[PDB]
Amino acid sequence: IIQHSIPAVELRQPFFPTHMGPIKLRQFHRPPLKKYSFGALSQPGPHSVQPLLKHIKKKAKMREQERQASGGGEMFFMRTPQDLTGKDGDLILAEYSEENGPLMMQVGMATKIKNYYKRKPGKDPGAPDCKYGETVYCHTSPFLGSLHPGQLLQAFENNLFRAPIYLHKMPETDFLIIRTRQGYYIRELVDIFVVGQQCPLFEVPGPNSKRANTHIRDFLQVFIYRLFWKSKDRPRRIRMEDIKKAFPSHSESSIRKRLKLCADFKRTGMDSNWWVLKSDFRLPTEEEIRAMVSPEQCCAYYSMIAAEQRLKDAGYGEKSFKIDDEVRTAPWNTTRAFIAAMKGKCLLEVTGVADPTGCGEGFSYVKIPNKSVAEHQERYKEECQRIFDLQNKVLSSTEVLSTDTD
DNA sequence: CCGTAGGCACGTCTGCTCGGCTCGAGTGTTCGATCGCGACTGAGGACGAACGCGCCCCCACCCCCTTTTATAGGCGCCCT
């Protein structure tokens, strides 16, 4: 059970962008430092980097007191955008080995760490302890390969994906800088996980699929309801211009569709007119709005449009998505293939063009039929096992390489 | 007679309707594969017929009964 932060659950901006142009899609999950137009750090010259130690201790203390003040047990702390800052709480880094994994979290979403352990035969004294995560004793593997007896494997686990992770040490040279309009802050950060290839648990839709079109529609609908809720006017009213600015690729006519059932156009002598909430229309509750569209569904959709943009950039037209190698790497194909195989509907290529590492240390998620048929499945498991073990060994290794001069 | 107001026209924006295109779903037909049945072949075992071997009988061949006579050494037995 995953409980996301309130800003994420509410699909607030900027945590959940309403629109992304080509540039943003290319930079998806890699935001570049952009200059500020105003505020302290818009100014030239040196700027102080501030310590956070007193602040970190204080927030931990305040949070624990709030915990004891009601009057123990479990509390949920991620209620406001302010609670999501890197400025307090314990922090880890996670570095993703896939250049563009099929699903990624937005800021404000939650994930668990699970410590998968397989018992040694006979008298097992229990799993080793880890600094992070909750131990899970598993007789069957949640991955493509099987755990060996006595093997502990850490992993990220959420509704988008499961992925093995490997704990490493941050280099002694490195610090985390947090940057706001107001100043820089610095934190020590020692724990950094390498993330291995994802096992997708959520299916990414194809471009212009019914699923995709239903999603943008519903997301637009949610944004609209939230606009009415934000309005302080009675009767509530919103401006077309504000919707168009958030959804610049929607025609005014398609926006009028979403508005015709809940609101009335009020014309004024000025090129700004209002849509006023109908007096017999009951605005959906917070709880009902949340049920309309989940953060996971937004993540699936984002994955599609970003991939679609990268494909266009590489010369692959919409008619391409009998199929080109590059199109096989698309998240709508890889997630579909992996999930089908998880349900026993087919097997996976494993060795193939969709291996995200390009060098045999990752899996190619491409459907092959279940179609000597005990040898067919034993060969699939053997190959899965080999790559599974290879990935764990390479990504957990502390060996120092050796810059490639090419 | 002069100035102000009103009306008309034009443009822009929004909404509604109509048409066209695309996508999806379902149903039907055709093709391929699998399964089943039958036939053939091969192998092994059993039964019957023919040939060979073994056993018994028969046949064949040779000498063994006797007589005669000349000759003469050695043996053993009868009663003188």
Would you kindly provide a written description of the structure presented here, covering whatever features stand out?
The protein is α+β, with helices and mostly antiparallel strands and 406 residues long. The protein is 32% helix and 17% strand. Strands 2, 3, 4, 5, 6, 9 and 10 form a 7-stranded mixed sheet that branches. Strands 1-8-7 form a 3-stranded mixed sheet. A 3-stranded antiparallel sheet has the order 11-13-12. A hairpin with a 3-residue loop joins strand 5 and strand 6. The radius of gyration is 25 Å and the shape is globular. It binds one DNA strand of 80 nucleotides through residues 210, 240, 252-253, 256, 260, 265, 267, 271, 273. It is classed as transcription. The entry lists the keywords tfiid, tfiia, transcription, RNA polymerase II, general transcription factors, preinitiation complex, core promoter, DNA binding.
Provide keyphrases for this structure.
1 chains; 406 residues; alpha+beta; three-stranded mixed sheet; DNA-binding; Transcription initiation factor TFIID subunit 1
